């Protein structure tokens, strides 16, 4: 509805930007403000043109220079901003799975929120970059019903388009109701099949019908009937089908509220959504939590890290 905070700059000069960035980094010390004033006011495509211009105008490599000059969370945001869109998702997935230990929250967030077309691009880029299957890595790094959900999302077999069959809607809702009657533990395969196979229009109709027949939101039933990462994956699917901007508002809230900060999630959401739907995310955040997103970031971060996140917020 409202769209991104970061837009293409109108008077963009890639050579001038390269000069500005080199001046900011040349010699002892850094003008971090100058780096933000350029990069946070260009879109991801424009940033790639600056990388090309920096090689031809400065005789140096921009990402290499920024990695050398910057540290910590600030470095992570800036390098992430500089990364092509699809590759950034690819790299986040790889980081989530590399070594023993698995960032399951990252896997859920990307695989439930991207469209099947985006997931296909991510899957192909991952394969090209690493010589590894995305699906095979997911299979190794997750288990049981959670694994099945993530493999399905990554394999891109969900029905597409918006064809609406009322009889099938009714059947799917009835099947989910029946799965909730069990005296023994839900029928988890049915949640898997419905939530991973059906098109969005169909699912929105199933959610409505499910509330009509059960008197509960499907989210409430998911929370009562399932647990662990599987529960989290099913909720993320439902939330992203209903309104992805709201889902991301919740993720930002969770990343900052309470004891500790999940900087990896904060950074990834702010970088990956700034150009897409940040104004909508802001609106939902305010409706949900009665505070501005800006003020959360302001109150929970500091330094140049805070400064760049606040520009990405608008
Ligand atoms: Ca320097």
From Swiss-Prot:
Residues bearing the modification N6-acetyllysine: 211, 291, 298
Function: Calcium/phospholipid-binding protein which promotes membrane fusion and is involved in exocytosis.
UniProt GO MF annotations: calcium ion binding; calcium-dependent phospholipid binding; calcium-dependent protein binding; identical protein binding; NF-kappaB binding; phosphatidylserine binding; phospholipase inhibitor activity; transcription regulator inhibitor activity
Modified residues (Phosphoserine): 10
Family: Belongs to the annexin family.
Locations listed in the record: Zymogen granule membrane
InterPro entries documented for this protein: Annexin, Annexin_repeat, Annexin_repeat_CS, Annexin_sf, ANX4
PROSITE patterns for this protein: ANNEXIN_1 (PS00223), ANNEXIN_2 (PS51897)
Protein name: Annexin A4
Phosphothreonine PTM sites in chain numbering: 5
């Amino acid at each position: 509805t409202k769209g991104g905070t970061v837009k293409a700059a109108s008077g963009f000069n890639a050579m001038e930007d390269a000069q500005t960035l080199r001046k900011a980094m040349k010699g002892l010390g850094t003008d971090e403000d100058a780096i933000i004033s350029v990069l946070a006011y260009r879109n991801t495509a424009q940033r790639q043109e600056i990388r090309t211009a920096y090689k031809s105008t400065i005789g140096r490599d921009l990402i290499d220079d920024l990695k050398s000059e910057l540290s910590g969370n600030f470095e992570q945001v800036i390098v992430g901003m500089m990364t092509p869109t699809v590759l950034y998702d690819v790299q986040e997935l790889r980081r989530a799975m590399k070594g023993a230990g698995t960032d399951e929250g990252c896997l859920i967030e990307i695989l439930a929120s991207r469209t099947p077309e985006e997931i296909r691009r991510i899957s192909q880029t991952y394969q090209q970059q690493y010589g590894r299957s995305l699906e095979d890595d997911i299979r190794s790094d997750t288990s049981f019903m959670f694994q099945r959900v993530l493999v399905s999302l990554s394999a891109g077999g969900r029905d597409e388009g918006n064809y609406l069959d009322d009889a099938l809607v009714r059947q799917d809702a009835q099947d989910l109701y029946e799965a909730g009657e069990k005296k023994w533990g839900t029928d988890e395969v049915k949640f898997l099949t419905v939530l991973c196979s059906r098109n969005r229009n169909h699912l929105l109709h199933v959610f409505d019908e499910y509330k009509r027949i059960s008197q509960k939101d499907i989210e409430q039933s998911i929370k009562s009937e399932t647990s662990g990462s599987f529960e989290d994956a099913l909720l993320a699917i439902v939330k992203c089908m209903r309104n992805k901007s709201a889902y991301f508002a919740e993720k930002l809230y969770k990343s900052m509220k309470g004891l500790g900060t999940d900087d990896n999630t904060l950074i990834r959401v702010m970088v990956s959504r700034a150009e897409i739907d940040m104004l909508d995310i802001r609106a939902h955040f305010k409706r949900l939590y009665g505070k501005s997103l800006y003020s959360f970031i302001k109150g929970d971060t500091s330094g140049d890290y805070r400064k760049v996140l606040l520009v990405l917020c608008g």
